[PDB]
Amino acid sequence: PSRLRKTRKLRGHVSHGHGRIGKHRKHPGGRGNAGGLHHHRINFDKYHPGYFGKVGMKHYHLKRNQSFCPTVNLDKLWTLVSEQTRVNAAKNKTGAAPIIDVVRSGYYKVLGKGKLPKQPVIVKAKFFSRRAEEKIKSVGGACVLVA
Amino acid sequence: APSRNGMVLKPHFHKDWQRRVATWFNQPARKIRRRKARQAKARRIAPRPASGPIRPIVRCPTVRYHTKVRAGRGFSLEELRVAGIHKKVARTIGISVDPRRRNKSTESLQANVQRLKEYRSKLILFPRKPSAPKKGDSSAEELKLATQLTGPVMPVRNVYKKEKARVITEEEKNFKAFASLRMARANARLFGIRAKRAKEAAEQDVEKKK
RNA sequence: UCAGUAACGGCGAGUGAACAGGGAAGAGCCCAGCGCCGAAUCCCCGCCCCGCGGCGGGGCGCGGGACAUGUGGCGUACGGAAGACCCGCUCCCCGGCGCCGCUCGUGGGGGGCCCAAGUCCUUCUGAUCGAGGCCCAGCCCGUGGACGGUGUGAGGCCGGUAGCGGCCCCCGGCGCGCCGGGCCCGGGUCUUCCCGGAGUCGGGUUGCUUGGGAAUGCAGCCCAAAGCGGGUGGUAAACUCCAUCUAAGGCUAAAUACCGGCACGAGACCGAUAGUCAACAAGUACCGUAAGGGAAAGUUGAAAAGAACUUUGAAGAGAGAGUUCAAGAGGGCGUGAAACCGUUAAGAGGUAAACGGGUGGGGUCCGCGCAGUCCGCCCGGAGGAUUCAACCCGGCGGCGGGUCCGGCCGUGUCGGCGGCCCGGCGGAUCUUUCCCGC
RNA sequence: GGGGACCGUCCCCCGACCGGCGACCGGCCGCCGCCGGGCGCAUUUCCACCGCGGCGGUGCGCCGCGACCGGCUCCGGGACG
RNA sequence: CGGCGACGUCGGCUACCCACCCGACCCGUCUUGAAACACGGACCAAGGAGUCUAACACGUGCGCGAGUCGGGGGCUCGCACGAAAGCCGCCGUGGCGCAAUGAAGGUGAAGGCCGGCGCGCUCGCCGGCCGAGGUGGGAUCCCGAGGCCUCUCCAGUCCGCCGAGGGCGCACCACCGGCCCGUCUCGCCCGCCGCGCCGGGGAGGUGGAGCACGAGCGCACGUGUUAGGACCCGAAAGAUGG
RNA sequence: CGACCUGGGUAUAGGGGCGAAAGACUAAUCGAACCAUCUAGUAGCUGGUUCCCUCCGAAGUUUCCCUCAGGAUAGCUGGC
RNA sequence: UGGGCCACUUUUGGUAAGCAGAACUGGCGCUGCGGGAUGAACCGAACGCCGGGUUAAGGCGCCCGAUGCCGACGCUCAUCA
RNA sequence: CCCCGCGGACGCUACGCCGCGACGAGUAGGAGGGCCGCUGCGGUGAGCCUUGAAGCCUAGGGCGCGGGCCCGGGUGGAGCCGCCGCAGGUGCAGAUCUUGGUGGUAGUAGCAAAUAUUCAAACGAGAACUUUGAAGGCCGAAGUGGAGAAGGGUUCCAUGU
RNA sequence: CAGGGGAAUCCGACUGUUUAAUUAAAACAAAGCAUCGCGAAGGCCCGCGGCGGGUGUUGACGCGAUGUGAUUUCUGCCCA
RNA sequence: AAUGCCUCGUCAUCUAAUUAGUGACGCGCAUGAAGGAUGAACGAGAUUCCCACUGUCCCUACCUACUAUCCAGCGAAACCACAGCCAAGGGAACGGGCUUGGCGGAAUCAGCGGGGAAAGAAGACCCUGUUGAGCUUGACUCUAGUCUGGCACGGUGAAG
RNA sequence: GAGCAGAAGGGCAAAAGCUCGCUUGAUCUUGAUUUUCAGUACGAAUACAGACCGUGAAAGCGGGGCCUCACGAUCCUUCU
RNA sequence: CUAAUAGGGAACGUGAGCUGGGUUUAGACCGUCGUGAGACAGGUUAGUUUUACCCUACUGAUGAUGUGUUGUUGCCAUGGU
Ligand SMILES: [Mg+2]
Ligand SMILES: [Mg+2]
Ligand SMILES: [Mg+2]
Ligand SMILES: [Mg+2]
Ligand SMILES: [Mg+2]
Ligand SMILES: [Mg+2]
Ligand SMILES: [Mg+2]
Ligand SMILES: [Mg+2]
Ligand SMILES: [Mg+2]
Ligand SMILES: [Mg+2]
Ligand SMILES: [Mg+2]
Ligand SMILES: [Mg+2]
Ligand SMILES: [Mg+2]
Ligand SMILES: [Mg+2]
Ligand SMILES: [Mg+2]
Ligand SMILES: [Mg+2]
Ligand SMILES: [Mg+2]
Ligand SMILES: [Mg+2]
Ligand SMILES: [Mg+2]
Ligand SMILES: [Mg+2]
Ligand SMILES: [Mg+2]
Ligand SMILES: [Mg+2]
Ligand SMILES: [Mg+2]
Ligand SMILES: [Mg+2]
Ligand SMILES: [Mg+2]
Ligand SMILES: [Mg+2]
Ligand SMILES: [Mg+2]
Ligand SMILES: [Mg+2]
Ligand SMILES: [Mg+2]
Ligand SMILES: [Mg+2]
Ligand SMILES: [Mg+2]
Ligand SMILES: [Mg+2]
Ligand SMILES: [Mg+2]
Ligand SMILES: [Mg+2]
Ligand SMILES: [Mg+2]
Ligand SMILES: [Mg+2]
Ligand SMILES: [Mg+2]
Ligand SMILES: [Mg+2]
Ligand SMILES: [Mg+2]
Ligand SMILES: [Mg+2]
Ligand SMILES: [Mg+2]
Ligand SMILES: [Mg+2]
Ligand SMILES: [Mg+2]
Ligand SMILES: [Mg+2]
Ligand SMILES: [Mg+2]
Ligand SMILES: [Mg+2]
Ligand SMILES: [Mg+2]
Ligand SMILES: [Mg+2]
Ligand SMILES: [Mg+2]
Ligand SMILES: [Mg+2]
Ligand SMILES: [Mg+2]
Ligand SMILES: [Mg+2]
Ligand SMILES: [Mg+2]
Ligand SMILES: [Mg+2]
Ligand SMILES: [Mg+2]
Ligand SMILES: [Mg+2]
Ligand SMILES: [Mg+2]
Ligand SMILES: [Mg+2]
Ligand SMILES: [Mg+2]
Ligand SMILES: [Mg+2]
Ligand SMILES: [Mg+2]
Ligand SMILES: [Mg+2]
Ligand SMILES: [Mg+2]
Ligand SMILES: [Mg+2]
Ligand SMILES: [Mg+2]
Ligand SMILES: [Mg+2]
Ligand SMILES: [Mg+2]
Ligand SMILES: [Mg+2]
Ligand SMILES: [Mg+2]
Ligand SMILES: [Mg+2]
Ligand SMILES: [Mg+2]
Ligand SMILES: [Mg+2]
Ligand SMILES: [Mg+2]
Ligand SMILES: [Mg+2]
Ligand SMILES: [Mg+2]
Ligand SMILES: [Mg+2]
Ligand SMILES: [Mg+2]
Ligand SMILES: [Mg+2]
Ligand SMILES: [Mg+2]
Ligand SMILES: [Mg+2]
Ligand SMILES: [Mg+2]
Ligand SMILES: [Mg+2]
Ligand SMILES: [Mg+2]
């Protein structure tokens, strides 16, 4: 809605909000990121440190699928299965522990943020972290690996 | 000129973009046109499936999608050979065939030949001349049971084997997943240099004994 | 979508793909070569028949020519061929005779002609399509109340509009019996054979190009191949393993593009200095030697009914008269602003006008101005009339009622009698220890 | 692969008790109100008029005057310490 | 309380003309400074200048919420409106968010209280709990001695308000610890179908756009910046083809 | 009477021609013609920038810049 | 916005300057109003539209509001006061 | 336990209404409000209108701080507006602005290069300018003469206005 | 119709040409003088390109490139 | 000297008087040899003097033609914030407007050139711009053409 | 009233000056801070901490010069 | 020569008053400077001087207001001198 804008209020005021002294000129200071090392150096150094220069090794033909590896934390681990699975496991008299295959749910690596409930569980994953494996074993579970 | 905090922006509008702008006001018309063409094609191939030939089961290539299964371009020649369908006859009964796809394992091969056999059982082959049926099918079932299937023929579904809860054994509890992964990475990294050092040690052993 | 990413870049400004994934569409093939087959092949010219609708079929020719310096059939990297042995006879594509299902979201297309209902009553007007009405639940039709015309503003006055409405003419691909010709064996196993595109690849260098970075692609020049070879495997090189394809010959629909063209439909667009330059005898008039540049310009009225006739003047132009609802609409004529000008009326005037504040005078208008508001109660007087209250009958509402009686609503509560046949949908929960694929 | 079992939500019911009849409603009652018709026909009720009537509100057609009260202000007399 | 009231007068501070007193230089603009001997402006009419797209940032409104979003496609007589709307869910592919850190190989966010053991060796094998630590502030909330009542007192019935103190502490802030990745210094252990130039662990500093019971996603609106003709008009020039 | 004047026909075309030379002339244009297009070229520079009321209300200073008629930066401002 | 300028006082260069450059506070710029005849900056005072009262700085012969007080004391004559 | 009276103003668009106190300068600039204004769309006003829309004019009556608005009279002759939302090519005094029109200047500058006209008549409404006659002059054969090229293109010739 | 004349100084020898539209000159040109290149497979030059083209239907008494500027008289020194 | 700053050089001559002219001198700021110096004729070339001649002047007058002027007819343009009497003041430091004073009388005609810092043109001088263009050059970076080497076209025999 | 390398100022006496002896703290590291300042960088500097050392009997002192100046990003190169 | 041949201002008065000798465009020559293009408060030569009809001022020319109309003869405020 153009009826809600400053241009409707700026009718009758000669400079249209841009000043009488400095005016509204075409491109004072350059076009785009002009002069980022010369007369906009303070702005670039203040708000974008690290902007200029190269760091690291370049790698041609990066295929992101090769490095695709989504992760899930142990605090969200039990949400990959149904509520019924966890409840039945909790009230199960035997030592039968449910299997959570995180690859089926769409994750490859199991990270170890958060704590687990005190229920044995078999977790299938491509990769584990050290603390995730330790926390899975501490509740009496097991970590098995898939490819 | 930059103004306080912000994001360094790089718009790609330095190249007379206003001469090449693709508006989409013909998108609803295109949807209508494609829909009408689909309906006309389905009418044209009257009892044959609307979506087209049956496609094979195919596993997606890379490490990101290889847990997923989709429809392929066509059944391989090895699949058709061990299913017993001629490669030049399949395309007339509506089996797509990809002559350039090979089969690297037997599980995919067997899944696709079971797919071909199930389709061949589901097929209703009309006689070439309706008065005289040579070897096509029985008129009793082809008179009533012949209707145009909508959607893909036997759509490819991703099957997940259900894992029943089991008692964790002591071997599973004693398996060290993180250490196994780290040692496997190290072994794959150092396999070649270890072999070279073993060869050099063999040369050292023979020169020392000699 | 990846992705403003990998990468490129005075690594500055800036530039910048691909693969995988999801879809729209989906379709595959042909030579050369190697071989086999008595050149099996092709063009042309004559003569005969069937035809014409784009010129084909069939037949004859001691009729020409092309072609062994290679035509045709089989065959092409997915292997192929020939012999055997075994198995399956399974049925191709053309152009018509008559007729369907009449071809298709209910005609396939093109063309032509048609198909509902007020000009009813009273009125307004110059004219009306306006306003009021039209007993039976309401003027009439409505599968039609889009639109346009008509003297106003119309569903019913007219054209149209709706309709798996009607009639007529023409055109095109779809099945059956037959017609005329072609029309020739397919698969599986084994054996024996046969297998490929060269001044091309590749390398050097130069120039351009790309995101392609010790060189992505292209090209020039020079060098110049191989056959368990060759290409690619995004960091130059050597060795090694592996993966993947098979270059240097060819064809191919669909999805896709479309500011020119033919024909349509529509719009929260513009409304004659706007919108195309062009609503109009506009790429015109006109300008320039030429290339080229390039306008302005819409509106009487319902109907010309476009002012007969008289009169002055040489006429332009007038005064009368007349048409019209209106010429205070009179052919650049709807309305007809401002600037500017003429006249009339009022006022004023030696410090240029004009202006702010405050009064005064005059003028034009306004006030139904001109004996100045209404109304509540009470008092008095003079008059009317149903009837005032209270009771009776009937109807209707408001409120309340232990639920007085129901019907219930929320929340629990048991048997689940009741739902995977006699209710559903889900679950990453268990199973034949009844049943269809190892 | 089916077909079952179980679980979780549901959809209708058979039912007892619980809060309420609610802004989900009917029937009865009780009170109240209104309307219609009777009766009531006159010290009641209502209608219009008159008085230069009284009391209330707003307010005078125009031009004016006065009074007292209060707010602010400028002055002037008198008296006391 | 008085006067005056229809063809002459009554009221109308606005509005027309005129008179007088006081005040009053011509606007726009650049500028320290304009009435300027600074520039533009004879007059009138109509036209005439911060727009749209894309991308960000913050604020605000809405919906859903550890998710959110169908925008591309498809399905619904194909079509007055409707090129709209509706739907899909094994169309959520994908985007953004839910995880950071390192150049990379890669690695990748839970601790506290109470016990017996080695030597409770600045500590390894366990048990039991609880589930993101503590300090100082901290809206709100909770308790609360004691008071506030009636015609009066000896004696309890039920709750209302004030209330010194005390408590649990939201968000947020400051500080101290803790955890994750990089990198240094020191150091002793552990693991094994690969005993290795293998793998894991600890303590103390330090670098990170981190964690420490999520806040995002989509839509709309505003503002600001930017690329585009970019608020409007304006060069001297440069290039291509005639 | 001459390196004379002049008609017509021809030739030379734009970074080119032609010049007894003045940067002269090349269609009233020449120290680079004219026409159309790229092109709405760029401008830190000049001019302009359209309704009302209410509330708040500056700066001409610091640092850096081939910076000195401009910017970024801090300050001063407003809004939430 | 990033051209500033002015005044008291301090202060540098300059013979000086309505010159150039600093410090401090105020002002003008952005600001009208009373006074200084006139005037960006001086003196007083800052502003919504009004009535009454009273002041500031400045004035009170006439212009021009106000001394038209029987104002007080002196000084001064200018043929450029 | 209100009852000879059965009765008792207004209010409270809660985005409303009421009370009290202080305050009010403003360029550049920012913000809010706008029952200010323009054009179009979705709703709504059982809106308005040929018994007169828009537009325009007006010494007419008023309202609002204002932007502006309403009403009367005239002219005009066919369409228009209010409210709730939506959307902009949305408001002009300036730009040596664009296009169009119109002033003062101003009945002014001017209609002054190449010697020069005059008398009578005719036609005619009308004669300094046309035609005829008479006179006086000029070009003075390198012409103000008679013919062509280029260029123009019907200007040539009659008749009429 | 139809020359004012004389004595000198500077510059250019003369005649010629020149900035159309402010400069007619002392500027340019000129004959004369001097230098340079070239024997054609060449000199100088054009051309995007062709063994293309101009000089050239030419041949050193000729083409091409420069300077100075009639006559007369001289034209010195310096190759760092 | 068309070349000399100092310089109006010094001397002579020309005049009453000469920053002029001519002749001469020459340590010549900074003359000079393919250009130096001469020399007839020539020149719409620059300069000085003399004779003659004259309104150039003393010192102005008069006459003629066409205008201007007045009239009939016809009929523009430039320019224009508003306009138009001054003195002083202060002020963007030179006012038509403002302050204080002087004062101010319709409508006009022929002239005139003091003002309107009159009109004409977005100053050409000067500066600025990270705006150009024409030209030059051992400015930076290139380039046509040319010189040279190499490979190819590109072969057959001998001698060294 | 000398000297402390240099400009000047400050500072300094069994010193910071002069002469000897031994040495390489002019070394290897992480942070914090000060100065200019926008509280950015560079440069320079201060106080620490961890190594390894020097000197001295030791306390200690020293990671350059008594203090105030003596210097340098991205990209590229080179070395470790 | 004369009495004397004083000094000045008025946008260094006065270019829609003139002139154009000078400086200060484009042509050209010399000297100096510069490699060169080119430069020289060095010299020399040739080089377009536009508009008034508006307002005012000034010069002259008609007129105008007032005394009823009109005419004759006069006075002198003021200004010049
Ligand atoms: Mg403002
Ligand atoms: Mg500025
Ligand atoms: Mg598809
Ligand atoms: Mg992304
Ligand atoms: Mg590119
Ligand atoms: Mg063959
Ligand atoms: Mg009909
Ligand atoms: Mg109609
Ligand atoms: Mg109709
Ligand atoms: Mg029809
Ligand atoms: Mg590699
Ligand atoms: Mg038009
Ligand atoms: Mg119009
Ligand atoms: Mg006429
Ligand atoms: Mg009319
Ligand atoms: Mg008209
Ligand atoms: Mg009039
Ligand atoms: Mg200006
Ligand atoms: Mg100035
Ligand atoms: Mg001004
Ligand atoms: Mg001035
Ligand atoms: Mg000027
Ligand atoms: Mg200017
Ligand atoms: Mg104008
Ligand atoms: Mg002007
Ligand atoms: Mg307008
Ligand atoms: Mg849709
Ligand atoms: Mg996904
Ligand atoms: Mg706390
Ligand atoms: Mg901490
Ligand atoms: Mg921002
Ligand atoms: Mg523009
Ligand atoms: Mg250029
Ligand atoms: Mg020249
Ligand atoms: Mg332009
Ligand atoms: Mg720099
Ligand atoms: Mg400026
Ligand atoms: Mg100063
Ligand atoms: Mg300012
Ligand atoms: Mg202020
Ligand atoms: Mg002020
Ligand atoms: Mg004052
Ligand atoms: Mg004074
Ligand atoms: Mg007052
Ligand atoms: Mg006074
Ligand atoms: Mg007085
Ligand atoms: Mg004195
Ligand atoms: Mg105030
Ligand atoms: Mg204010
Ligand atoms: Mg506009
Ligand atoms: Mg205008
Ligand atoms: Mg304006
Ligand atoms: Mg005249
Ligand atoms: Mg004349
Ligand atoms: Mg004669
Ligand atoms: Mg002739
Ligand atoms: Mg000559
Ligand atoms: Mg000579
Ligand atoms: Mg000439
Ligand atoms: Mg000339
Ligand atoms: Mg001349
Ligand atoms: Mg000679
Ligand atoms: Mg010569
Ligand atoms: Mg020599
Ligand atoms: Mg001389
Ligand atoms: Mg003389
Ligand atoms: Mg001499
Ligand atoms: Mg010589
Ligand atoms: Mg004056
Ligand atoms: Mg200028
Ligand atoms: Mg200019
Ligand atoms: Mg600059
Ligand atoms: Mg240049
Ligand atoms: Mg060079
Ligand atoms: Mg240390
Ligand atoms: Mg004198
Ligand atoms: Mg002068
Ligand atoms: Mg003058
Ligand atoms: Mg002049
Ligand atoms: Mg001169
Ligand atoms: Mg000159
Ligand atoms: Mg001359
Ligand atoms: Mg006198």
PDB file of all heavy atoms in Angstrom, chain J residues 21-25:
ATOM      1  P     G J  21      61.830  54.928 -34.286  1.00  0.00           P
ATOM      2  OP1   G J  21      61.655  53.512 -34.663  1.00  0.00           O
ATOM      3  OP2   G J  21      62.824  55.321 -33.269  1.00  0.00           O
ATOM      4  O5'   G J  21      62.172  55.736 -35.606  1.00  0.00           O
ATOM      5  C5'   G J  21      61.328  55.645 -36.738  1.00  0.00           C
ATOM      6  C4'   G J  21      61.766  56.567 -37.842  1.00  0.00           C
ATOM      7  O4'   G J  21      61.716  57.943 -37.402  1.00  0.00           O
ATOM      8  C3'   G J  21      63.188  56.398 -38.323  1.00  0.00           C
ATOM      9  O3'   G J  21      63.345  55.286 -39.181  1.00  0.00           O
ATOM     10  C2'   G J  21      63.459  57.734 -38.991  1.00  0.00           C
ATOM     11  O2'   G J  21      62.836  57.788 -40.262  1.00  0.00           O
ATOM     12  C1'   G J  21      62.719  58.687 -38.058  1.00  0.00           C
ATOM     13  N9    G J  21      63.613  59.260 -37.041  1.00  0.00           N
ATOM     14  C8    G J  21      63.589  59.014 -35.700  1.00  0.00           C
ATOM     15  N7    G J  21      64.506  59.663 -35.049  1.00  0.00           N
ATOM     16  C5    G J  21      65.164  60.386 -36.022  1.00  0.00           C
ATOM     17  C6    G J  21      66.262  61.262 -35.920  1.00  0.00           C
ATOM     18  O6    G J  21      66.874  61.609 -34.914  1.00  0.00           O
ATOM     19  N1    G J  21      66.626  61.774 -37.146  1.00  0.00           N
ATOM     20  C2    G J  21      66.012  61.478 -38.323  1.00  0.00           C
ATOM     21  N2    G J  21      66.512  62.074 -39.406  1.00  0.00           N
ATOM     22  N3    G J  21      64.996  60.657 -38.441  1.00  0.00           N
ATOM     23  C4    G J  21      64.627  60.148 -37.256  1.00  0.00           C
ATOM     24  P     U J  22      64.599  54.308 -39.008  1.00  0.00           P
ATOM     25  OP1   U J  22      64.308  53.075 -39.756  1.00  0.00           O
ATOM     26  OP2   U J  22      64.947  54.213 -37.580  1.00  0.00           O
ATOM     27  O5'   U J  22      65.773  55.069 -39.752  1.00  0.00           O
ATOM     28  C5'   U J  22      65.616  55.502 -41.091  1.00  0.00           C
ATOM     29  C4'   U J  22      66.638  56.543 -41.454  1.00  0.00           C
ATOM     30  O4'   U J  22      66.415  57.743 -40.678  1.00  0.00           O
ATOM     31  C3'   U J  22      68.077  56.182 -41.153  1.00  0.00           C
ATOM     32  O3'   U J  22      68.649  55.342 -42.136  1.00  0.00           O
ATOM     33  C2'   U J  22      68.741  57.542 -41.055  1.00  0.00           C
ATOM     34  O2'   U J  22      68.956  58.078 -42.346  1.00  0.00           O
ATOM     35  C1'   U J  22      67.647  58.359 -40.381  1.00  0.00           C
ATOM     36  N1    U J  22      67.796  58.415 -38.912  1.00  0.00           N
ATOM     37  C2    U J  22      68.792  59.180 -38.354  1.00  0.00           C
ATOM     38  O2    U J  22      69.590  59.813 -39.007  1.00  0.00           O
ATOM     39  N3    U J  22      68.837  59.172 -36.992  1.00  0.00           N
ATOM     40  C4    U J  22      67.999  58.499 -36.147  1.00  0.00           C
ATOM     41  O4    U J  22      68.157  58.575 -34.935  1.00  0.00           O
ATOM     42  C5    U J  22      66.994  57.736 -36.796  1.00  0.00           C
ATOM     43  C6    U J  22      66.926  57.727 -38.120  1.00  0.00           C
ATOM     44  P     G J  23      69.700  54.220 -41.704  1.00  0.00           P
ATOM     45  OP1   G J  23      69.982  53.360 -42.869  1.00  0.00           O
ATOM     46  OP2   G J  23      69.224  53.629 -40.439  1.00  0.00           O
ATOM     47  O5'   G J  23      71.016  55.049 -41.394  1.00  0.00           O
ATOM     48  C5'   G J  23      71.672  55.770 -42.421  1.00  0.00           C
ATOM     49  C4'   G J  23      72.784  56.617 -41.869  1.00  0.00           C
ATOM     50  O4'   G J  23      72.245  57.630 -40.990  1.00  0.00           O
ATOM     51  C3'   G J  23      73.797  55.898 -41.007  1.00  0.00           C
ATOM     52  O3'   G J  23      74.753  55.194 -41.765  1.00  0.00           O
ATOM     53  C2'   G J  23      74.385  57.027 -40.182  1.00  0.00           C
ATOM     54  O2'   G J  23      75.310  57.774 -40.951  1.00  0.00           O
ATOM     55  C1'   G J  23      73.158  57.893 -39.950  1.00  0.00           C
ATOM     56  N9    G J  23      72.505  57.606 -38.665  1.00  0.00           N
ATOM     57  C8    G J  23      71.325  56.958 -38.455  1.00  0.00           C
ATOM     58  N7    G J  23      71.013  56.876 -37.198  1.00  0.00           N
ATOM     59  C5    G J  23      72.049  57.511 -36.546  1.00  0.00           C
ATOM     60  C6    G J  23      72.268  57.746 -35.175  1.00  0.00           C
ATOM     61  O6    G J  23      71.566  57.430 -34.218  1.00  0.00           O
ATOM     62  N1    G J  23      73.449  58.431 -34.954  1.00  0.00           N
ATOM     63  C2    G J  23      74.300  58.844 -35.932  1.00  0.00           C
ATOM     64  N2    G J  23      75.397  59.485 -35.536  1.00  0.00           N
ATOM     65  N3    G J  23      74.109  58.634 -37.209  1.00  0.00           N
ATOM     66  C4    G J  23      72.969  57.973 -37.439  1.00  0.00           C
ATOM     67  P     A J  24      75.272  53.774 -41.251  1.00  0.00           P
ATOM     68  OP1   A J  24      76.238  53.278 -42.248  1.00  0.00           O
ATOM     69  OP2   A J  24      74.095  52.965 -40.869  1.00  0.00           O
ATOM     70  O5'   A J  24      76.078  54.121 -39.927  1.00  0.00           O
ATOM     71  C5'   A J  24      77.303  54.822 -40.005  1.00  0.00           C
ATOM     72  C4'   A J  24      77.748  55.351 -38.668  1.00  0.00           C
ATOM     73  O4'   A J  24      76.688  56.094 -38.032  1.00  0.00           O
ATOM     74  C3'   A J  24      78.133  54.331 -37.621  1.00  0.00           C
ATOM     75  O3'   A J  24      79.412  53.781 -37.846  1.00  0.00           O
ATOM     76  C2'   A J  24      78.046  55.138 -36.337  1.00  0.00           C
ATOM     77  O2'   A J  24      79.199  55.939 -36.170  1.00  0.00           O
ATOM     78  C1'   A J  24      76.873  56.067 -36.636  1.00  0.00           C
ATOM     79  N9    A J  24      75.633  55.650 -35.968  1.00  0.00           N
ATOM     80  C8    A J  24      74.481  55.149 -36.500  1.00  0.00           C
ATOM     81  N7    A J  24      73.570  54.892 -35.601  1.00  0.00           N
ATOM     82  C5    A J  24      74.162  55.258 -34.411  1.00  0.00           C
ATOM     83  C6    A J  24      73.718  55.238 -33.090  1.00  0.00           C
ATOM     84  N6    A J  24      72.517  54.807 -32.732  1.00  0.00           N
ATOM     85  N1    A J  24      74.558  55.661 -32.135  1.00  0.00           N
ATOM     86  C2    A J  24      75.760  56.092 -32.501  1.00  0.00           C
ATOM     87  N3    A J  24      76.294  56.162 -33.706  1.00  0.00           N
ATOM     88  C4    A J  24      75.431  55.724 -34.623  1.00  0.00           C
ATOM     89  N1    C J  25      77.636  52.883 -32.422  1.00  0.00           N
ATOM     90  C2    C J  25      76.828  52.653 -31.304  1.00  0.00           C
ATOM     91  N3    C J  25      75.549  52.318 -31.498  1.00  0.00           N
ATOM     92  C4    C J  25      75.044  52.222 -32.692  1.00  0.00           C
ATOM     93  C5    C J  25      75.818  52.465 -33.854  1.00  0.00           C
ATOM     94  C6    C J  25      77.099  52.796 -33.652  1.00  0.00           C
ATOM     95  O2    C J  25      77.289  52.734 -30.190  1.00  0.00           O
ATOM     96  N4    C J  25      73.763  51.893 -32.797  1.00  0.00           N
ATOM     97  C1'   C J  25      79.055  53.286 -32.334  1.00  0.00           C
ATOM     98  C2'   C J  25      79.989  52.163 -31.886  1.00  0.00           C
ATOM     99  O2'   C J  25      80.863  52.689 -30.904  1.00  0.00           O
ATOM    100  C3'   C J  25      80.767  51.853 -33.163  1.00  0.00           C
ATOM    101  C4'   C J  25      80.765  53.176 -33.898  1.00  0.00           C
ATOM    102  O4'   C J  25      79.469  53.721 -33.603  1.00  0.00           O
ATOM    103  O3'   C J  25      82.080  51.385 -32.919  1.00  0.00           O
ATOM    104  C5'   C J  25      80.939  53.082 -35.385  1.00  0.00           C
ATOM    105  O5'   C J  25      79.953  52.241 -35.954  1.00  0.00           O
ATOM    106  P     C J  25      79.684  52.243 -37.515  1.00  0.00           P
ATOM    107  OP1   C J  25      80.969  51.838 -38.206  1.00  0.00           O
ATOM    108  OP2   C J  25      78.399  51.481 -37.775  1.00  0.00           O
TER     109        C J  25
END
